[PDB]
């Protein structure tokens, strides 16, 4: 018995440090803590699969229980990135087969996943795979799904939201129905399945006592009546199809919703079917009206009934009128997303525009907001100012102004952005997407000056000249990922701003004063810095990121890797 050191106790304590950023530090205090963290780290996320080789991953963290890889750039969700760009999952599943023998959960986000790679994953991991998320992935088929549901007999959570695959049959669902007992969350929310049987889904409900969340494609809600009675513990449901016919005026009206349902979104729901929610609206904490067929008036009447709403996603039909309603009935609101609606033939109705009026109303009512993302038809410096004054502890704020309107009240937004960034000092993610007149070099510098905590930024049509990019670039102490499109800045200005930014590890840019020369981007050639061009086949894109691995082997023909003198 000698004086007990931290060393006599660190193996034990390390497993109580949960925060990824504290593990980060701990791994750096000395060779031993490095090794303990290495052997005990349970979860790792890779924001860009090309950032390191799978060998490196499994040497550093041999006992991962949970992995999450992202592939294609965010821009891919907006049809801006070629389908073949990259994000092949296959080296990662072979590494998982051989060296991550503890893995129980895999989340692939925006990646190419083939049937062969999911067959391998299924056989390698089998009963140990508790959760698989194919999140906005492509490249597989129902054969792959069948393979994982037959070999992974204990899957608790299985997700395919927004993935594109080839649907050959429905036996994957049937196979779950017949043998799976353990399913807690099943999610094919934003997917075309035409060969699966609602009976199978019902039988899954009947067999999976812990089934808490299910999201689904275009199933006729009436066909799910059995499912709803059987899903006793269901807390979340999204999807289905509400198809009214004049024939049955009360087609629905007799829905048994599980008594616990509190997070939901019924697709195509109209004003006539809306009322099946009233009986338990006091209970609803999450609402997804994103695919709803209801008008600005109808929004107000439903929102009004949901005092405990904390999450709302919806199209801009919500209108200023709707935001006013939300402003005083739902004081607990934490997250709001206003996507953009049918923007061709009138804004869906003559109230389906949100503006300064709504924003300022919202700022005053829902002061608990942590996430606010909004496609707005018109802004004013004043509204930004009130966001900044009233709703502190906003963590993620995104504003895009539509291109529909001709006149925008007052445009140069410099003084608004500036007070917004100053009041909301908890802000980690920030998107600001405008029109040319929108922000001046002076405002652009404000953004860089007053955003000490921002890790990610999407900048729209900001600034007037290179002066603005450069002034911006002397700020942003913590900017890690920067996405800019529709900006004027020149090749040498981009290059120079990248050089100045202390924390930058990812850059995606569309629209910039190019030059066939190419050679101006080169003035940011650092070691470990990969620059890729997607040529003007849409305007040229620049993708650049740090990587310990070197240049990817697997580029398409549409993507040119920039290296020193040609």
């Amino acid at each position: 018995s000698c004086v007990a050191t931290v060393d006599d106790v660190i193996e034990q304590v390390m497993t109580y440090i949960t925060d990824p950023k504290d593990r980060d530090s701990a791994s750096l205090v000395c060779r031993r803590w490095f090794k303990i963290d290495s052997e005990t780290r349970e979860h790792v996320t890779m924001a860009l699969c090309y950032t390191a080789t799978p060998d490196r991953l499994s040497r550093r963290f041999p006992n991962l229980r949970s992995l999450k890889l992202k592939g294609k750039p965010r821009a891919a969700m907006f049809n801006l990135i070629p389908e073949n760009w990259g994000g092949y999952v296959t080296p990662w599943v072979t590494e998982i087969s051989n060296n991550l023998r503890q893995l129980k959960s895999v989340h692939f986000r925006r990646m190419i996943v083939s049937d062969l790679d999911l067959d391998r994953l299924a056989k390698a991991r089998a009963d140990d795979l508790e959760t698989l998320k194919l999140d906005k992935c492509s490249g597989f088929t129902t054969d792959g799904l069948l393979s994982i549901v037959t070999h992974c007999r204990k899957i608790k959570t299985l997700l395919m939201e927004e993935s594109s695959f080839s649907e050959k049959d429905g036996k994957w669902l049937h196979e779950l129905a017949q043998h799976n007992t353990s399913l807690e969350v099943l999610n094919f929310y934003m997917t075309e399945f035409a060969k699966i049987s609602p009976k199978d889904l019902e039988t899954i409900a009947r067999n999976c006592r812990s089934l808490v969340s299910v999201k689904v494609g275009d199933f006729e809600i009436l066909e799910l009546v059995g499912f709803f009675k059987a899903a006793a513990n269901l807390e979340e449901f999204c999807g289905g199809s509400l198809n009214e016919d004049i024939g049955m005026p009360e087609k629905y009206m007799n829905l048994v919703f599980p008594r616990k349902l509190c997070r939901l979104g019924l697709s195509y729901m109209g004003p006539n079917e809306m009322p099946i929610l009233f009986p338990f609206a006091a209970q609803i904490r999450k609402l997804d009206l994103l695919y709803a067929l209801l008008e600005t008036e109808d929004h107000c009447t439903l929102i009004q009934k949901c005092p405990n709403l904390e999450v709302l996603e919806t199209r801009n039909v919500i209108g200023d009128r709707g935001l006013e309603v939300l402003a005083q009935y739902c004081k607990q609101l934490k997250r709001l997303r206003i996507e953009r609606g049918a923007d061709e033939q009138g804004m869906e109705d003559e109230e389906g525009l949100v503006s300064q009026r709504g924003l300022i109303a919202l700022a005053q009512g829902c002061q608990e907001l942590e996430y606010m993302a909004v496609y707005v038809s018109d802004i004013t410096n004043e509204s930004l100012e009130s966001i900044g004054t009233y709703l502190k502890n906003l963590c993620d704020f995104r504003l895009v102004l539509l291109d529909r309107e001709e006149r925008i009240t007052d445009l140069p937004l410099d003084n608004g952005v500036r007070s917004l960034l100053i009041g909301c000092k908890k802000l980690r993610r920030f998107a600001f997407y405008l029109r040319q007149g929108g922000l001046t070099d002076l405002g652009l510098s404000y953004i860089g000056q007053y955003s000490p905590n921002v890790r990610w930024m999407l900048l729209g049509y900001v600034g007037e000249s290179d002066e603005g990019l450069m002034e911006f670039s002397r700020g942003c102490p913590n900017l890690q990922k920067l996405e800019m499109r529709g900006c004027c800045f020149s090749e040498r200005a981009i290059a120079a701003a990248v050089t100045k930014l202390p924390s930058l590890r990812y850059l995606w840019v569309q629209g910039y004063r190019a030059s066939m020369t190419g050679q101006d981007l080169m003035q940011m050639a650092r070691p470990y810095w990969n620059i890729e061009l997607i040529p003007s086949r849409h305007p040229a894109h620049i993708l650049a990121y740090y990587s310990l691995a070197g240049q990817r082997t697997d580029c398409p023909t549409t993507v040119r890797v920039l290296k020193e003198p040609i």
Partner: peptide
């Protein structure tokens, strides 16, 4: 033009 609403804005009309 998000890829989830581009599918809907057409399943709508």
């Amino acid at each position: 033009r998000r890829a989830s609403l581009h599918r809907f804005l057409e399943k709508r009309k």
